[PDB]
């Protein structure tokens, strides 16, 4: 096989004795990228103001966020300097090397400001038109309010501030496509308020973090794209 082929090997010394992937000196074995990809990382972080929401703005969406196992497309503005100096996370970088996937994501949505009953809902097949989220008044007529019978979840920001949910993989096809260009992905995730708590005069600060589920798998290893060093920022 041409990728791993090694002709005429000239090796001066023996090979180095093994630590069982670090289990000898540390306690754990770092043998796999799928375990590194299950440590949570930031996904999208935004603010939402009154007045760029709906007119009536009782139980409505605040964000429809597209679920991609690679990241959303990043733009490194001056508001969140994360996306600027840290570039992408470890998950978009691991993901850019594989072609397909099959499996779900885990999310952690931390929506505060607001401190009322907030809700989340997964539309497994309404994909996949764009690489940004859509805020408030710009989400389309039929993604505006909650729907009936889509898998959803509800939480009082008074009891607890963090919603942690796991999105299933519901698709007709064999794979979902990593590195899509722009029914390929995991569909949409809608986040929204449950009935018109008055909004603080600055912001509802939402931030989504994500990871890989347990049954998730990266599937066909082609190359990595060209990278950019973070220390050059």
């Amino acid at each position: 096989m041409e990728r791993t082929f090694t002709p005429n090997v000239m090796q001066p010394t023996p090979l180095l004795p093994t630590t069982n992937d670090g289990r000898v000196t540390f306690g754990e074995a770092f043998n796999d990228l799928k375990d590194l990809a299950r440590r949570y990382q930031l996904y999208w972080e935004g603010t939402i103001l009154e007045g760029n929401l709906r007119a009536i703005r009782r139980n409505s969406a605040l964000v429809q966020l597209p679920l991609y196992p690679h990241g959303l497309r990043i733009q490194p503005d001056v508001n969140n300097p994360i996306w600027n100096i840290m570039r992408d996370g470890h998950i978009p970088v691991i993901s850019s090397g594989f072609r397909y996937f099959r499996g779900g994501l885990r999310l952690r949505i931390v929506v505060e400001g607001l401190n009322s009953c907030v809700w989340v809902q997964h539309h497994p097949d309404r994909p996949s038109i764009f690489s940004r989220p859509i805020i408030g008044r710009y989400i389309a007529a039929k993604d505006a309010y909650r729907n009936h019978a889509y898998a959803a979840y509800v939480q009082n920001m008074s009891v607890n501030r963090t919603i942690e949910v796991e999105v299933p993989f519901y698709q007709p096809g064999l794979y979902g496509m990593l590195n899509a260009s722009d029914f390929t992905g995991l569909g949409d995730l809608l986040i929204g308020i449950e009935g018109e708590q008055p909004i603080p005069k600055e912001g509802i600060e939402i931030s989504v973090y994500y990871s890989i589920a347990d049954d998730f798998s990266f599937n066909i290893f082609c190359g990595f794209p060209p990278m950019v060093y973070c220390d050059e920022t």
Partner: protein
């Protein structure tokens, strides 16, 4: 050459084609080979197999590359595949047609297909030219959000590829198991996706082609490509004229 005829050539016969090869090949497999199982879940009609037609090897292109134009990573071949191979036969208007070539005759009467491919590349230089080519394949490369950064041969060295050394003048065989987002591909433009677009096949120029300064030496060299299908299964019999083909879109 020590015998009256030069030496013993080696023969690779499939169906009614026979391909001579004098050297040791350079092989690779684009992913793990398997036996399709969930494809039975997609279609209630029996999948038809045409081993005498499709297993046969087929000559695809000849691309010419010259000394004056060999950069590092000049693309000789950049094609949507199998789309370019199957739609290779065009009429006067550059509209493809599945009717002439006997390997492609079942693409005409069916709607969906599935199959594995093997691409084989041939370069016949003399002894005194030296160069190097890389032929790699990227599963559904055209749909990738950065498809035009992955064309550097530094990126191709990572996806499954073969190498053709022009000094040695070897063969090269790239097996491509069927992998896709759905258990079948479309054969024509239906239900308004391009037909039969499983990936992108590249041929780049890893080390530029060099010859001697003498005037009568060859300043050019040919590259030929043969392709064959393997587990080809067709489903969804319709009329040949019920759907149309439009001239293909090219890659940037």
């Amino acid at each position: 050459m020590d015998r009256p005829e030069g030496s013993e050539e080696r023969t690779v016969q499939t169906s009614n084609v026979v391909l001579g090869e004098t050297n040791i090949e350079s092989q690779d497999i684009a992913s793990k080979e398997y036996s399709p199982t969930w494809d039975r879940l997609a279609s209630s009609e029996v999948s038809d197999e045409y081993p005498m037609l499709t297993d046969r090897w087929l000559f695809w292109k000849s691309v010419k590359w010259e000394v004056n134009d060999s950069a590092f990573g000049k693309m000789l071949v950049q094609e949507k595949f199998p789309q370019s191979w199957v739609q290779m036969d065009v009429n006067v208007n550059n509209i493809p047609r599945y009717t002439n070539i006997p390997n492609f005759i079942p693409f005409n009467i069916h709607q969906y297909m599935r199959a594995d491919f093997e691409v084989k590349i041939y370069v016949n230089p003399n002894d005194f030219v030296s160069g190097w080519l890389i032929m790699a394949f990227l599963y559904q490369g055209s749909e990738m959000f950065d498809y035009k950064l992955r064309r550097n041969p530094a990126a191709l060295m990572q996806m499954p590829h073969v190498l053709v050394n022009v000094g040695a003048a070897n063969e090269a065989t790239l097996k491509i198991p069927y992998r896709y987002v759905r258990p079948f591909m479309r054969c024509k433009d239906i239900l308004r996706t391009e037909p039969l677009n499983m990936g992108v096949l590249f041929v780049e120029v890893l080390i530029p082609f060099r010859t001697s300064a003498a005037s009568s030496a060859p300043k050019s060299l040919d590259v030929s490509l043969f392709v064959k299908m393997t587990n080809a299964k067709f489903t969804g019999m319709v009329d040949g004229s019920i759907a149309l083909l439009s001239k293909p879109i090219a890659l940037p």
